[PDB]
Design an enzyme around this catalytic site. Structure first.
Site: not given
Ligand SMILES: OC[C@H](O)C(O)[C@@H](O)CO
Ligand SMILES: OC[C@@H](O)[C@H](O)[C@@H](O)CO
Ligand SMILES: OC[C@@H](O)[C@H](O)[C@@H](O)CO
Ligand SMILES: OC[C@H](O)C(O)[C@@H](O)CO
Ligand SMILES: [Al+3]
Ligand SMILES: [Al+3]
Ligand SMILES: [Al+3]
Ligand SMILES: [Al+3]
Ligand SMILES: [Al+3]
Ligand SMILES: [Al+3]
Ligand SMILES: [Al+3]
Ligand SMILES: [Al+3]
Lengths: 393, 393, 393, 393
Positions: D52, D55
């Site tokens: 993300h 992250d």
């Molecule tokens: O941003 C989405 C990610 O792939 C996961 O953390 C989700 O599937 C949580 O269920």
């Protein structure tokens, strides 16, 4: 409907004190001062407050900190007049409890968890609590081979019996109340439902002072009927306390405002709490404790609103429950469905199994065909129930 | 893997005898002769057969019909050598039981249901059965107000605690075992899970001869862990019998072949049945009874195949369970996770609550921070478990 | 509240015609004459009636039987004035359909199932039906390897996209509507939910005349939110029809009276049906069809009572839904929560992605911290909703 | 089985980077350095890494911090040779997203969430990602009246189409992949399942570059069949990416190691991924991405073990899946069940609805009775499947 302490509504410091941190996000609200909470709740019409040892005194608190917190808290209680009917230990938040407290595979952790509980029992005694709740949130497993299931139940019994024995030796006016939960945080929590809790209690040496503290949302996460659950707990005379909240299905614990989950179930739960059983029997006298969380989308006004909502929901459902049973049409409907007939013993006064067996009218010459034609009219009875809940009839 | 009667595999006459009629369709197979079934099962390697009173003798059977059926059946048993370890009553199919048997609101129906059971107890005794199972399929409700929950539990107790007394008076070598289920054909069935069943047993006057008969699919319909359930039943020494089958989720009762539902759970269930508990304890000696239904899409060959499948699945899982525990790597993995450590009592020999409380090393000077760093390695243990199940080691 | 045909309430011949046969028991009621049903429903205030081809004409009916049935039925309709807004085919009861109709692995069965449907389309046309529903109850599997999942969806498309073409060629004023269900009588039914149904429709050649026919109990068996489901169906303009009933959890299909399952959900479903969307948008004009079953514990009086109950429940919920939205306090509560604000486009008139990106106030200099402090007051809005449902305001 | 980058296994930085903080407790592990993670994963045999935006780069990062992080990260990638096949935005952790990003009732928050995404699209492009995942964890509601369901779907479409249009204008080799989830954190998340996701995509203006990214645990939380779900996504040619993990029932998201949840389902999922469809058709070429979390009871060794476990589980299941289909007995079993027969079109070459209708052999003179006698042998086929999974046959 305006609540008063007479109603005996209680809230956990952690309910309104929940800042919003959940699995996928951070806290959305600022911290709530325990003294402020006591004053606001008093103001709202609450009868008492509850808390985990760490809700009030932090895990890493020093003596001076502990002393000033308790001091302020006690003054707040004396001012408001709020009672502390129940206290509980936090055996789930600290990382040391990652594998549980009482049933942790690590022995030193088990000893620490039990000692933490024994100390909390003294505090509850000083707080004047009447019930000591135990919710083993971390006692369980994600994998089946992580635990010796027999040993786990032994360690669980050891902690509970040790705690109960301590209460007895000290002469404390306390009773332990277990709080079953299927899953979450744990994938599979030990003693997942009311029944498992009741059965477990029968294996205890000091079971005379151990009961249950069922939760609406907890039984519902297992897809079970809450009213039916508490009914069996009442029947067994083990309904020491109760946690009221809302759950909308088999999923993560929502811990919504009471009545904000399964509405019809909520109505019937209150019906049982207030009206008891139709053919007579015991009734629950304990506190109507709300164990929910104000949705993280709302601010502090919402927090105080949710506190009011719980009490309003109960008081509204209560009126409808009383009117429901008071309705003569409901009384006749109950008669027709055989509600009172169920209260009749199957066997006759002084009748034995043999007598029954050899009673032709009851078996050999029994007309099961004609008997099968009875219209129990269960649907109409339910329609009258719902109409009262809606405020029609 | 080839099964033998030594394994003690048993099947209900109604399992293989199921013709396919379900809620939305008619039967897809013809009438399986009870004598043929006995011969085929014997041929397959089964140890015994079970049946509802009406599986064998029809509800409307005349004396001559009853006599010829039993006569043929007994000759079949004597020829094949098959045993009848368990018998049960059918208190759900006939329309008279639409509102249950023992807890029907109608009193005459309750008396009839109990008399039907008392008579069935005599048959079981003649059949040489050791367990008398009871599945209150119709004892429950769709609406909360249809029953006085307290009265219902009273009527339920009356029936069992009527039946059990009869067994005692007759001196029958029988034990009653309750078959709990969350729901269906009812919305909410009384004593929905193992725990509720165990707890209920503690309120009985003749509880000494009443136990449980858990079912894989039944506990799973409530989303609970079956292995954990039977574990608690074993611990309480109430595991009198067991029904094995497959269920793939919280839905209608599929009653698939054992191992055809939750595979990993099945593996661990057999692990418990065969290996017992790691730190020692009791083991289940009863029959490995399969209570499933051959899918209606299949013909009679499929029926006989499913019968074999159940036994094969068990025997395959068994090998993997034994090898699993025999693996030295699994033994060390178990040590590291603290599986045996859990078998250690929290308190020391002769230690009291007070001693523990005042043990600084266990509380005051306890380093919960360092303690929290332990790697329980539960994931690796589970990986080794699964690898054994897959035949990878 | 007294219903009139203006309300457009419809019932399936099979709803009130259900005799009680379920998975674990036989029928508890006698044979409801289709002509009697038409007269009773008319009398009750129903607007129309629906039926499976076989509800009216038996699978093994001869020409003379078919002719006399239809003749009597049509005279009944002409007398009462009842309409037949919807017709559907029975592709699940006969043993030939044990593996489904359209997706049966057996090709001759697929051809037979499709031919049966094509013929039923002619009948519906003669009945003057406007919607042709399809509930692939048997299209699915208990085991994953029993079907080629791609092929199954192809065969499914072939059937619909066979039927739809036929409707077009004949010039019938008909539209096909699929009745999705997660499972039962199958373990896993193809196109288990509204979403799967909508998506599937997009792969059809004649998708212009194919929509959905969602069901309260069906979506709820998957644990989904029904109101949310129909909302997406409405949004996509594919809400051709609707089946209303009650379901109390993730279990077998109870098919209770509408409002007898999830009460709050029912309230909001009607709110959407009657009030539509707050910021405007489309509304459902189709019939309010009830697809339930009178509980087998009740006799014929109960049957007729349940028919009334469905209409009463809807009419009661309707009043509360209208009053709910009419309440000025509810309007301001909606404003505060941002209900109407959501109706505002994120981007500005003529704004592009690039413009937004380079808008400092919207990103670079955006104060996410202060923004996060907004009290959406979602709890209070829900409390006002529930209070209206209870007739407290 | 030893994994290699050829297998194309990928992990999210947040999977192994999860420190253990859950709803009821704090983190149990120290933070994982992104550079260390890249090196360890490379070492383990992983093909790539995902993350993300937050992250890698913290929400409150300054330019110098952002620059040093990316700099170190890129050097780590160049050294190890790890790829970054997918990137996603974090629209759920920050309190500003408490009511969602794209569908937040607050308009300024919607604009901020979209801008955050547009910027993340540039990063993904620089990272060389091929897929941009979107998991709307916060898009939903706890109460039905909190949202205008139509408006919500409009705002959702606005964000996705704006993002997709941006990708097109920039000429990025990217494709958006939506990730449905029933509930949690939200009580009810918009586009809860694969089907809802696919259907939604059909209402988009730039749907040509938008697909799905299904998750084992997500579909299972709705009680649906994952293999069936991805099968429909593959059939629709919308399977752009996939998240593999384990879930043991309808409860909170566990996000266990792949194969540690529903074992048989996992086996069949891999069977589909590797073997594709029996009668031919498309196959998934994308990365085998694992989206799980190392249980908080375990330390860092456990973390690295779980990373290995995911790959081992897949490789083990793969072998068994290939052998399964290669088995001649399985081929004949498939023939007998009609698996290939389903691949045959119902209608004949050039046959119309009318022709079929008037084909007596297919309807009028069709013997549905004899046809119903076919033994599909679905149980035996499943037994052979399971035996291969266990490593028997
Ligand atoms: O941003 C989405 C990610 O792939 C996961 O953390 C989700 O599937 C949580 O269920
Ligand atoms: O679910 C059905 C029940 O399990 C019964 O078939 C019992 O085996 C005995 O009545
Ligand atoms: O669940 C059963 C299904 O809902 C059917 O009864 C449909 O109404 C039409 O086939
Ligand atoms: O200590 C137990 C409390 O009463 C609650 O927070 C639990 O019910 C959580 O479900
Ligand atoms: Al609680
Ligand atoms: Al709780
Ligand atoms: Al059984
Ligand atoms: Al059963
Ligand atoms: Al229907
Ligand atoms: Al239906
Ligand atoms: Al994911
Ligand atoms: Al996920």
């Amino acid at each position: 409907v305006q609540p008063t302490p007479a109603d005996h509504f209680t809230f956990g410091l952690w309910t309104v004190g929940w800042t919003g941190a959940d699995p996928f996000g951070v806290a959305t609200r600022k911290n709530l001062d325990p003294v402020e909470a006591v004053h606001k709740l008093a103001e709202l019409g609450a009868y008492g407050i509850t808390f985990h040892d760490n809700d009030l005194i932090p895990f890493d608190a020093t003596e001076a900190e502990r002393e000033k917190i308790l001091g302020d808290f006690n003054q707040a209680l004396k001012d408001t007049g709020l009672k502390v009917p129940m206290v509980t230990t936090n055996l789930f938040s600290h990382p040391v409890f990652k594998d549980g407290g009482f049933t942790s595979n690590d022995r030193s952790i088990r000893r620490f968890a039990l000692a933490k509980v024994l100390h909390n029992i003294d505090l509850a005694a000083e707080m004047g609590a009447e019930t000591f709740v135990m919710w083993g949130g971390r006692e369980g497993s994600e994998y089946d081979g992580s635990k010796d299931l027999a040993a786990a139940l032994d360690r669980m019994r050891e902690g509970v019996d040790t705690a109960a024995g301590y209460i007895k030796d000290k002469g404390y006016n306390l009773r332990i109340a277990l709080e079953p939960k299927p899953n979450e945080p744990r994938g599979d929590i030990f003693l997942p439902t009311v029944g498992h809790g009741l059965a477990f209690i029968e294996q205890l040496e000091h079971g005379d002072i151990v009961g249950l503290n069922p939760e609406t949302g907890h039984e519902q996460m297992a897809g079970l009927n809450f009213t039916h659950g508490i009914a069996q707990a009442l029947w067994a005379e083990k309904l020491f306390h109760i946690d009221l909240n809302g759950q909308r299905g088999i999923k993560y614990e929502q811990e919504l405002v009471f009545g904000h989950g399964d509405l019809t179930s909520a109505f019937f739960t209150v019906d049982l709490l207030e009206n008891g059983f139709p053919n007579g029997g015991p009734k629950y006298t304990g506190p109507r404790h709300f164990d929910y969380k104000p949705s993280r989308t709302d601010g502090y006004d919402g927090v105080w609103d949710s506190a009011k909502a719980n009490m309003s929901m109960y008081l509204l459902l209560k009126e409808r429950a009383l009117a429901f049973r008071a309705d003569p049409e409901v009384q006749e409907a109950m008669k027709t469905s055989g509600v009172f007939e169920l209260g009749e013993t199957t066997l006759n006064a002084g009748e034995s199994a043999a007598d029954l067996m050899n009673d032709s009218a009851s078996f050999a010459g029994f007309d099961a065909e004609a008997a099968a034609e009875r219209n129990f009219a269960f649907i109409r009875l339910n329609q009258l129930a719902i109409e009262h809940l809606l405020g029609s009839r």
